[PDB]
Each structure stands twice: as structure tokens, then as C-alpha cells.
Amino acid sequence: NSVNTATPGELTLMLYNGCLKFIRLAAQAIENDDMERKNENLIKAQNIIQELNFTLNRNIELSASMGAMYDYMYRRLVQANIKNDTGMLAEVEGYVTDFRDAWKQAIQSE
Amino acid sequence: LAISEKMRGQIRGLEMASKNSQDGISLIQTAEGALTETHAILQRVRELVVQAGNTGTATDLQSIQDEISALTDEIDGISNRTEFNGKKLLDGTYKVDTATPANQKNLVFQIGANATQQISVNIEDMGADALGIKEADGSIAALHSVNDLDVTKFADNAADTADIGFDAQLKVVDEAINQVSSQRAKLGAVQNRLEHTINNLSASGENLTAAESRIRDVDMAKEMSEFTKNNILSQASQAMLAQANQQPQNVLQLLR
């Protein structure tokens, strides 16, 4: 669209929102018994979490706990995929919502 | 960023093996979900065959046969349309062929710890003409497949009539039900092997990221999520320095 426009903080916010969107699409696919659709969206969500983790400046102290959460989020999404566990998806959706809401406030108050 | 950049190269192998195992499990779950439908349709077909064997009302027989023929056509549709990434799973593309191995196609999965041990997997034809009473070899003789069911023949033949009597046609459905159940169970065993691979891959990645494998359970993750969320709020500049390091063309690609 018009991405080169977005600031670095706005780019990260876009990633959090996309991750949530793909998790919600995968939960819906599980309800509709669409395995291929569920798998495609959870891998999309996993790729976002891994991109966030691998773009952490690990000289910054905050990066340790954020990356530990990303590692759990990735592992939990893999388990939810192979187990068709919407409950697990709702769990990871809550974490990403936590990160998304705090991040959106952080770029504002800055 | 360089510390995180090489951590990508360390676990790139584990991530791609994890994606392959996820893909393989979802392929099998796709086949198992379709086989569950075929099994349920076969159960309904058996109900109609039994009802036809106990009906003395032949236009009742024709109406029952119309439903059966539509149901076996549903079975054909499932076997012909079930797909994963464009690969036909249940139409016999991947059936075993011991009579002519040159014509056999295999599904390949990677199994075991480290996901490097390849296995070959076959899936039998699940169409209506491939389910029923099998001969010594893989073949189904005439009038012995689910596609051959015709309960209107019950009006002119005793129940013990060979091939077309009620008892014989009921046997065709029973054998077909078990054939679908056997195919689903064999695919479940493969799924189990891929699950064990995923858990060994995760344990391998957990060891290589010590102090980033730190979160164990739901209680820790819940509590760490709230703690990290409040640290992001309280240290906005540190949060920007820590995470706002994506390049725009990578973001557009991930959001497709």
C-alpha cells in the first residue's frame, strides 16, 4: 500500500495486528474444519512472531523477556496447530493483544 | 541486531523442520477429516440397506435406492475433491501397487528426532468402486463394490442370494466401513510419528535458547505477558530501541 510511509514503530504495530488477524482466521478455520486454511494462517502467525524475535536489539534489556515470550508464543501456536486447540489460540491471542495494546500506547507517548 | 540475526541461522533448520512437520500433520488431518465424512456416509448407506431388507410395502425400494446412489456419489465426490496443496489425497493417486510398483506414488514425510528420517506413506482409493468385498488381490469383483449396491434387486431375490441378496449387499457395506476405518487408523499412526518429531524439535530448540526458553507453562506465560506489557508501557524509548527494527519490504511480505 503506502508502507515506506510508516515510521519504524508503526511498522511493528502492523506486525502485531497481522499476527492477531491470522490467529483469528485460523481459529475460524478450525471451526469450519478447514485444516489447510488453519495451517496456512498459523504458519503466517508463526513467521511474524519469529520476525519480531529476530529483529530484537538484544543489547537492550527489554529484549530478553520479549524474546522469551515470543519463544513461548511460537511453541504454543505449533501445539495449537497440531492439536486443533482453539483454547490455545485464545491464549496466544491474549498475549499478542497485550503486546499490541502496550506497543500502540508506547509509540503514542513518545 | 546482529545477536538476533545469527540466532536466526542457528534455529533456521529447526523452524523449517517444524514447518514441514506442521504441513505434514495438516495434510493427514485433511485426509482424516474427509475419511470421517466417508465413514459417516457409509453408516447411513448401511441404515438404508437394512431398511430395504425389511421393507414389504418396490417403489419404496426405488426411493431407498435413489438415496443410496446419491450417497455413494457423495463418497465419490469426497474421494475426488479432497486435496492438500493441490495434491489429490483420496482418489488412489497414492495407493500401494505391489502388482506394478512402477505405477506407485508415495507421500514422503520426515520423521524421528531432528526430522531427517524419511518415510513413504500410501493412501488407498476411497471412491465407491474401490470399497467393498476384495478378492485375493487388491481387486473388487463385479457387484462387490459400494458403487454396485442396488436394493431394488431385493424384490426378486431371497436374502441369501449370492452377490445380490440382502446378506451379500449388506456385507459389501460392512467391509467398506472397515476399509475406511483402517485407512484412517493408519494415517493416525503417521500423525503420531510427526507429533513426536515436533516435540523433539521443540526440545532441541529449547536447549539451544537457554534463558530464552525460560517460559514453561501457562501460569508463567500469563504472568510474564502482563509484566512485559507494563515494562513496554513504562519504558517506551527502550521498547522502540528493542523492537522497532523491521524493514518495510519484509513487513509487506509477512502481511500477505
> Any residues with CB less than 8 A from the CB of B209 and at least 6 apart, and which?
A71, B7, B11
Report the C-alpha gap between B163 and B227 in whole angstroms: 72
Q: What is the dihedral of CA B176, B178, B183, B188, to 10 degrees?
A: 150
Half-sphere exposure of A52 (CA within 13 A, CB side): 34
CA angle B200, B188, B125 (to 5 degrees): 135
Task: List beta partners, residue B83.
Answer: B88
Q: Kindly state whether B12 is in contact with chain A, defined as any CB-CB distance less than 8 angstroms.
A: no
Give me the resolution in angstroms, 1 decimal.
2.1
Closest CA relative to residue B148, chosen from B165, B164, B124, B126: B164
> A18-55: buried (b, 16+ CB within 10 Å) or exposed (e) per residue?
bbbebbebbbebbeeebbbbbbbbbbbbbbbbbbbbbb
Alpha-helical runs (H) found in B83-217: 166-208
Residues B48 and B52: their CA atoms lie apart, in Å, by: 6
Q: Which residues, 6+ apart, have CB-to-CB distance to A10 below 8 Å?
A: A107
Q: How was this structure determined?
A: X-ray
Grid cell, residue B37, equals 465424512
In this structure, are residues B243 and A12 in contact, taking their beta carbons and an 8 Å threshold? yes
Segment holding B121, helix H or strand E: strand B117-121
Query: How far is the C-alpha of B4 from the C-alpha of B11, rounded, in Å?
Result: 11
**What one-letter code names the amino acid at A14?**
M
Three-class DSSP category at B88:
strand
Residue ranges of alpha helices (H) inside A1-110 are 8-31, 35-54, 63-83, 86-108
**Is A51 within 8 Å of B209 when comparing Cβ atoms?**
no
The residues, ordered by sequence, that sit 6+ positions from A7 with a Cβ below 8 Å of its Cβ are A107, B244
CA dist B198 and B204 (Å) reads 10
Query: Between chains, do A103 and B230 touch, taking CB under 8 Å as contact?
Result: no
**Hey, which residues 74-113 in chain B have their CB within 8 Å of chain A?**
83-85
Nearest CB partner across the interface for A75, out of B19, B84, B202 = B202
Domains for chain B: give ranges and CATH numbers: 1-256 (1.20.1330.10)
